[PDB]
């Protein structure tokens, strides 16, 4: 009885009611979808409110009076296709018509309203509607929708957990094998995601062995893997539209050396401490957490005795942010404030790292090594929930799977 994987048709209806509760009388909202360029990717604001996944379409939501029972939901679609009778019987549209009638259907709606919500600042239907609007007021709408998307419902949390569980078990199966080229490890993880139950990849992945791990945007993934190096991998799957995101690092030989042990433990110490902070009663913000992660890393660098190198402060050995919001997009809702306290229902990542250069000022057993560890965390009232907990990361658990399986 679901409409899309994990979401029922009743929740989609309740999302439209909540937005209408913030609009004045005589308003209409207009949203245009994407076109085929390639596997299709819908415009995510229109998908959040309807679940429709066909190209060349327009959605309109209208509020005639001050009562919530007079709302009207329109859809214009191409004539496998669902059709005019299917978009009402399955997707629950109040009115519908063919997309070829846009030049006569839309003007009748605009003329009888006072407020028009449209993002004036590329789809084919978008360029058409914008050309029409260049005693009424035009207003933006995209930022206002993002304040709803950042708080996940109990059903939304359950489908994100299933995608994180499938990706995490695939990592465990790769730990117990040996690979000699970056391309073989790449094609293995992709097949396990799909046969496990996911739809597709969530993003373009990283498979970087040896010195390749110093490039944050390395993507070629076609090099030979030596017996003396470690490898850094960043990849995950997606299901029903919702994304996951994971990072792990482990040695190619199957046993940690002494120098490899000391660097890995410094990164894992910071991550564990920051995850414990993710409680809504503490009143922390996302930027507060980033500031505390810088203070914790420089104490770890002092214990290693590598904190007084001329020209290499902490911002150059750890040169990126601590995390981001996660949802229908990988970098979800980037226009909300980083400086307000975190609320019950958000999902954020935690991913610190370290990267040592090839300079004589450092010990020879530390040059050209990079490490990163990342998980997905949901915020609760007086606790939290780790959505990717199946994938092991402790040193004793890692060596046990690599040697015994």
């Amino acid at each position: 009885g679901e409409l899309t994987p994990g979401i029922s048709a009743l929740e989609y209806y309740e999302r439209r009611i909540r937005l209408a509760e913030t609009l004045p009388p005589k308003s209409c909202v207009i949203l245009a979808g994407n076109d085929i360029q390639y596997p299709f990717q819908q415009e995510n604001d229109l998908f959040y409110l309807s679940g429709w996944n066909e190209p060349n379409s327009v959605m309109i939501l209208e509020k005639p009076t001050d009562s919530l029972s007079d709302t009207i939901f329109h859809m214009l679609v191409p004539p496998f296709r669902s059709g005019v009778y299917g978009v009402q019987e399955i997707f629950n549209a109040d009115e519908s018509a063919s997309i070829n009638d846009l030049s006569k259907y839309l003007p009748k709606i605009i003329n009888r309203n006072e407020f028009i919500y449209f993002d004036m600042l590329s789809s084919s239907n978008f360029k058409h509607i914008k050309s029409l609007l260049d005693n009424k007021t035009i207003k933006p709408i995209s930022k206002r929708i993002a304040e709803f998307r950042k708080i996940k419902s109990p059903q939304e949390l359950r489908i994100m957990r299933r995608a994180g569980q499938i990706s995490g078990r695939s990592f465990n199966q790769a730990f117990a094998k040996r690979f000699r080229n970056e391309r073989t490890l790449d094609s293995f993880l992709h097949y396990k995601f799909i046969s496990g139950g996911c739809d597709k990849d969530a993003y373009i992945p990283v498979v970087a062995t040896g010195s390749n791990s110093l490039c944050i945007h390395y993507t070629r993934n076609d090099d030979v893997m030596f017996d003396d190096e470690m490898v850094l991998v960043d990849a995950a799957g997606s299901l029903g539209g919702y994304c996951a995101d994971i990072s792990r690092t482990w040695p190619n030989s199957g046993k940690f050396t002494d120098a490899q042990r000391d660097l890995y433990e410094a990164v894992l110490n910071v991550q564990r401490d920051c995850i414990k902070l993710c409680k809504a009663s503490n009143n922390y913000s996302l930027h507060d957490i980033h500031e505390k992660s810088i203070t914790l890393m420089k104490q770890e660098l002092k214990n290693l005795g590598i904190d007084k190198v001329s020209g290499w402060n902490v911002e150059k050995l750890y040169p990126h942010y601590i995390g981001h919001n996660l949802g229908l997009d990988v970098h979800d809702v980037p226009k909300v404030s980083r400086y307000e306290p975190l609320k019950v229902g958000q999902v954020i990542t935690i991913e610190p790292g370290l990267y040592i250069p090839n300079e004589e000022s450092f010990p020879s057993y530390f040059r050209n090594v990079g490490i990163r560890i990342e998980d997905d965390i949901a915020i609760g009232e007086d606790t939290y929930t780790n959505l990717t907990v199946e994938a092991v990361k402790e040193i004793d658990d890692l060596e046990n799977v690599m040697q015994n399986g």
Binding site: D234, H320, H324
Partner: peptide
């Protein structure tokens, strides 16, 4: 991964 990382935003900035």
């Amino acid at each position: 991964x990382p935003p900035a």
